């Protein structure tokens, strides 16, 4: 699912860049002709807005973490058996060591 969102964001960005290039070409043409104070075509403007709205949808989905506020829920599954052992104090005196010693 994240890969699809990333690809969609990339495609939208590419479409936005293409719309920018089209608008640049339109203004370059406009500078050629005297007067003619007209606006850019509405179709490419709508394409620009479509590319802007699509890229803002995946930009929120890509980073969604929203962790739980309460601090009791993560330790709701953890068992006291694992907590009983600690990594500081480890005594290396067990029957498994002499049982696994030959093999």
């Amino acid at each position: 699912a994240p890969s699809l969102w990333k690809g969609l964001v990339g495609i939208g960005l590419f479409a936005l860049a293409h719309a920018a290039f089209s608008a640049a070409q339109h203004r370059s043409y406009m500078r050629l002709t005297e007067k003619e104070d007209e606006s850019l075509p509405i179709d490419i403007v709508l394409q620009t807005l479509l590319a802007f709205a699509v890229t803002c949808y995946g930009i929120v989905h890509i980073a969604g973490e929203f962790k739980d506020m309460d601090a009791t829920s993560e330790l709701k599954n953890k068992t006291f058996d694992t907590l009983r052992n600690h990594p500081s104090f480890y005594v290396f005196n067990h029957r498994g060591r002499v049982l696994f010693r030959p093999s």
Binding site: H18, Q25, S28, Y29, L32, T33, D43, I44
Partner: protein, 50 residues
């Protein structure tokens, strides 16, 4: 005969081939959204070929 000059004026040049081509390609009288999109695609293809 270029010594005594009475009146003088300066005029510009007609146009450039690529510039004229772009100006003609932009020229639209009455078209739908599909038409403008097709024209833009054709212009993009021409630019890619160039």
């Amino acid at each position: 005969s270029l010594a005594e000059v009475v009146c003088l004026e300066m005029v510009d040049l007609p146009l450039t081939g690529a510039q004229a081509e772009l100006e003609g390609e932009f020229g639209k009288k009455a078209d739908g959204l599909l038409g403008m999109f097709l024209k833009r695609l054709s212009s993009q293809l021409i630019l890619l070929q160039a």
